[PDB]
């Protein structure tokens, strides 16, 4: 499971800004707005530091909370 799945709740046009910031991170394969309110970003990639990502989001977009970290599997 070399690839990580990270789900982040963001106070969120903040959606486009939050999406651009995460999309621009090194190792990213995908970003997706998920949940019924589209108030979550799921990122899949390699060598992504969730702590740096949450910090980037909080200084740039607004409140953000790590919700889910799992591996992908083959």
């Amino acid at each position: 499971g070399l690839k990580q799945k990270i789900v982040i709740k963001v106070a969120m046009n903040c959606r486009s800004k939050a999406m651009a910031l995460v999309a621009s991170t090194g190792g990213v394969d995908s970003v997706a707005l998920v949940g019924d309110l589209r108030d979550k970003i799921e990122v899949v990639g390699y060598g992504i530091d969730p702590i740096k990502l949450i910090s980037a989001l909080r200084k740039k977009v607004g409140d953000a909370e790590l919700l889910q970290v799992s591996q992908a599997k083959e």
Partner: protein, 79 residues
């Protein structure tokens, strides 16, 4: 709580990795808080109210984890 009659989660399957087998739903006093997908016969770490919980999936997408009081996350089949 009843998963047969819960609206399918808003999901995105990354094309570069296998499709996750399970939908999941998080409740606090039965009031749906959250949802998403997960791999069966697997595991994830999830923020469940105050606490990080290491949730195990069996191959029928059943989810075991030490959930804080008044919280649960339940798993199931994707079409």
């Amino acid at each position: 709580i009843d998963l047969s009659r819960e609206r399918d989660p808003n999901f995105f399957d990354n094309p570069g990795i296998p499709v996750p087998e399970c939908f999941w739903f998080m409740f606090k006093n039965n009031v749906r808080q959250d949802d998403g997908t997960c791999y069966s016969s697997w595991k994830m770490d999830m923020k469940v109210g105050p606490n990080w919980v290491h949730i195990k999936s069996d191959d029928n997408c059943n989810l075991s984890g030490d959930f804080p009081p008044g919280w649960i996350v339940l798993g199931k089949k994707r079409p």
